[PDB]
Amino acid sequence: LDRADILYNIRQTSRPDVIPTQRPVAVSVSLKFINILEVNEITNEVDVVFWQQTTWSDRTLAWNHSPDQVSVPISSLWVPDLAAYNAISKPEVLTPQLARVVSDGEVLYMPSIRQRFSCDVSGVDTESGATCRIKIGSWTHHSREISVDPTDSEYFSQYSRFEILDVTQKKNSVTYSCCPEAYEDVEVSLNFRKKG
Amino acid sequence: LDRADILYNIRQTSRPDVIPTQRDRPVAVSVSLKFINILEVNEITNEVDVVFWQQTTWSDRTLAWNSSHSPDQVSVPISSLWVPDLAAYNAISKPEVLTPQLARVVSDGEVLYMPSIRQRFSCDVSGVDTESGATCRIKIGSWTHHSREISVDPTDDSEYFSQYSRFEILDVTQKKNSVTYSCCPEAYEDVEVSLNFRKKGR
Amino acid sequence: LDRADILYNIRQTSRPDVIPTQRDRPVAVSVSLKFINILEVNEITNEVDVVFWQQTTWSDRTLAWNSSHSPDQVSVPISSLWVPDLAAYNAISKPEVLTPQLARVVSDGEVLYMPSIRQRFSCDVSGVDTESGATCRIKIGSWTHHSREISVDPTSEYFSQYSRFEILDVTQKKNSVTYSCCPEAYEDVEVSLNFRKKG
Amino acid sequence: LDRADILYNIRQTSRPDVIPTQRDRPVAVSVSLKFINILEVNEITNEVDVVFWQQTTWSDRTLAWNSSHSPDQVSVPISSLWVPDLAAYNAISKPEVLTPQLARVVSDGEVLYMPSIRQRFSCDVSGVDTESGATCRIKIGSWTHHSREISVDPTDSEYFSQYSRFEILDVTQKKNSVTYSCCPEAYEDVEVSLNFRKKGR
Amino acid sequence: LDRADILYNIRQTSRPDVIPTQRDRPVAVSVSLKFINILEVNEITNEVDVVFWQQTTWSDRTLAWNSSHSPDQVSVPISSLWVPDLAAYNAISKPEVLTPQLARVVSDGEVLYMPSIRQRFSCDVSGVDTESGATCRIKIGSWTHHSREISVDPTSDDSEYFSQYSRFEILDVTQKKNSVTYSCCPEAYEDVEVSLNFRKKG
Ligand SMILES: Brc1ccc(N2CCCNCC2)cn1
Ligand SMILES: Brc1ccc(N2CCCNCC2)cn1
């Protein structure tokens, strides 16, 4: 097997529409914040840029003197239907939409995303700063099909008007009126402020 | 049958172009708006910027499958399904679909589709900054299918509404109508969702 | 024939790239604008932002079917039909199509397409804030098909009560114009929108 | 041959990825800008927002057909044709194509494509508000094809909007052949000089 | 071989999904930014709007052909080629590609791709209106391919193609190459840092 063969196989046998459940798919989500571009304390809206690190297992991609990994167009893979509940724009994907697939079927996808959110911006210009909570989960898959779990400034722009004080991550299971099942989400709390 | 098989069948066999009429009866579509946020109101221009889950429900028997020893539901790309051609009459921007465009299909052919949508509308914003608030009428119906092909029907208000909005929801009421338009002889159905909201105090 | 069969046939035999001309003659296209809203006006730049239903009508016989015991009409994705290449000459943005892009096809091959469109135009906005108002002229015609191939003809009821503006009158004029580039004449309809700001 | 056959043949046979080079000579492309409107000007930033028909003409013999008893012309989706990779060097936005993207093909293989385009440019806007006006120079040429592959050649207010805040004083066209540092070959361009000025309310 | 044959061949057999890594070594990608314009600067937000030719160079042997009696080069739609997944780390808008998206392929498999791009960046704009000017750092590298698979290296005059009508002028351009690790991953990924030193014109 060479890269070409591996990539050919994944393409022809790829089943993107099909959730790779084994005998729920455990999805890991983590936001790596890169920049905060605009803030509005009046409207409670922020414009953020972050790497959305997403991790899961699709055994149907696995393979046996060959490369251990390849980069694969996500259009050829099943991807979890994650959405940000309080996003107020559709995510602008900044980077090439490639996933990374390991021979055992593990998948990394980590696009850089710019997106606007509705959240608590109050206090942004104080010592203690604002704490903006972003809620991400599967849109249509309940807890028996997809589970999400977590995994501050390492990649954060030194040239932003703002700075990051802290990032905390909390996991939840919520029942919505529309449906009987519980749907999991991760809540990323971004604590930031305008700089002195 | 496993998920893969079900989704393969749907892929191959589903007909997105074909209205799942039964015996020349109209497809009964259920519509309900779950308001999430109100982003920018303009009392001068009478325009509002709203975010809502558009909960849409209908039956397409051609999707059904014997679920005796199979999954009861699957998530399906709406590009693989027939979807009702609903439109908001008083929308002034095309709908921005925020969420993955997946429908949920039950073994008996019932379909849920509930994308989160951001869309600007032209409606009555007068009084938005009063006790009584504004009452914004959003009108949604089939664009091209009359009452004998498609029928629309309604199904907490603020249950999913953002606590961080500058606004608050006082009430949401849903009214159903049947309208005849100058272009065409037939009647076309619509649901009118009345959103009663106001600016929050200082 | 049921809907499925009709739609299968149309998809299997549709030539979306081929203008359905009856012998040497031109396809008769009907165009009519049903104004829904006026959103933004600029009397300085002479630019208006308008929302209108673009009612378009023509005949494609190749779509017809024996409806003796079959549905009389179906809704069809316009990607599966030939559509006239109409454009607004004085549009300054590409048309934003607001509604599902479905046409309506009758068993005899008549086609209705009426999407709701938001588009900005360049036109005379002067006087918009006077009792007599502005008169904004919008010119729509086939872009590449001349009069021998395509002919266009005209056909507040749906106007938003919440617009800052009101419609005084709408008139439609059809024209045939010769352009520098080409020897042939190209037809267009001119819709004159007479509107003003409200009290 | 009817229209359907002609369009089928072209769709199934024509090759858009392939430059219609005849006899190892360059494809002669004609370019001409028909200005329709000037929408926004900024004398500070030296940026203009313009709308123009981009009249483009060339020969692709591989499209030709015996029109003895057939239509002389058809309209064809440009996605089905080879099109010259023309670009405006000083454009600062990608071209917004306003019209249906149809070319016109004559039985002998001549092609007209004339979409209406809105695009913003960086150019000399100084003097826009004077009697002589500004002269905004627009440079168009093949992006990747050098002079032995593609040659560009030229051919004012006729189609210009009476409702623009501006008016056109003159349009001149100049043709050039330039060698860029990056590459050994010469690349041709046409420079359209737009001479315009602000009208007054 | 004529152009048509070569292009039929490339199209028919080219795998855009496959990194053309010869014998286990990394594909050597050359990157160079030719700045064309600076359109808007904001010293407060530290954001710049830039237009540049992104000169990109690499080898894909699988494209090569015997050019004994054939054309030496062709222009090819990049959708038909493998292209390195380069991204600007500090870009804050997705790149607007201004030019036709054609690569140039030489008979030996060398590829040039040089689109003109307009993109906005977050970087140090401080001092833009002084003698020494601002120095805006742009970081470009492979997004998913580490140093064993893709290596990036720099490629003349900063202002050779720069617009004389810009409100700004270029004082200097320097290029630095680095090798950096990231949390998600054990391997090192290469990048080139282009330092753009510019200021307001008189
Ligand atoms: Br179809 C379909 C089913 C459920 C949902 N949601 C409800 C369940 C949890 N996520 C929020 C969206 C959306 N579309
Ligand atoms: Br095709 C076709 C037929 C009817 C309509 N309209 C009229 C009836 C109801 N919705 C408004 C649009 C639009 N397109």
Ligand SMILES: Brc1ccc(N2CCCNCC2)cn1
């Ligand atoms: Br191809 C081709 C030929 C002619 C035209 N125009 C000129 C004729 C009337 N409509 C305006 C555009 C556009 N494309």
Ligand SMILES: Brc1ccc(N2CCCNCC2)cn1
């Ligand atoms: Br590939 C490739 C090679 C050269 C160029 N340019 C240089 C030659 C003339 N136009 C400027 C763009 C663009 N793409």
Ligand SMILES: Brc1ccc(N2CCCNCC2)cn1
């Ligand atoms: Br898949 C995948 C793997 C790694 C990364 N990143 C880390 C390596 C360098 N570029 C930044 C993003 C992105 N996507």
